[PDB]
Amino acid sequence: LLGDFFRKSKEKIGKEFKRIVQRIKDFLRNLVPR
Amino acid sequence: LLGDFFRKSKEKIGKEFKRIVQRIKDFLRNLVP
Ligand SMILES: CCCCCCCCCCCCOP(=O)([O-])OCC[N+](C)(C)C
Ligand SMILES: CCCCCCCCCCCCOP(=O)([O-])OCC[N+](C)(C)C
Numbered sequence: 001l002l003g004d005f006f007r008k009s010k011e012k013i014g015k016e017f018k019r020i021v022q023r024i025k026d027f028l029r030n031l032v033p034r
Numbered sequence: 035l036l037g038d039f040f041r042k043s044k045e046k047i048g049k050e051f052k053r054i055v056q057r058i059k060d061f062l063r064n065l066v067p
Binding site for chain 2: 002005006009010012013016017019020023
């Protein structure tokens with residue numbers, strides 16, 4: 001998303017975002033189980 | 035962004051973003067003094 005620059009920063013951001021998303025998903029599957 | 039949840043994660047994202055932006059600004063200032 002910035003060519004080859006800011007690899008470690010882009011990784012960190014990516015990880016934190018994936019975790020917010022994953023945690024929200026878990027909350028939703030507690031809220032509305034199948 | 036998400037109320038009071040994910041305080042640490044949002045702080046992390048914000049910081050890394052501010053650092054990317056700072057480096058971009060530095061490069062641009064060197065490119066065009
Ligand atoms: C078009 C205007 C925007 C240009 C973006 C600024 C690019 C200049 C960044 C220069 C310093 C920050 O490099 P970085 O991310 O620590 O690199 C990681 C290691 N490499 C340098 C080998 C890739
Ligand atoms: C519809 C989508 C809603 C998603 C909301 C899911 C929230 C998930 C909560 C877990 C994520 C982290 O929060 P926490 O470390 O427990 O907060 C600690 C600080 N307070 C208690 C004051 C807030």
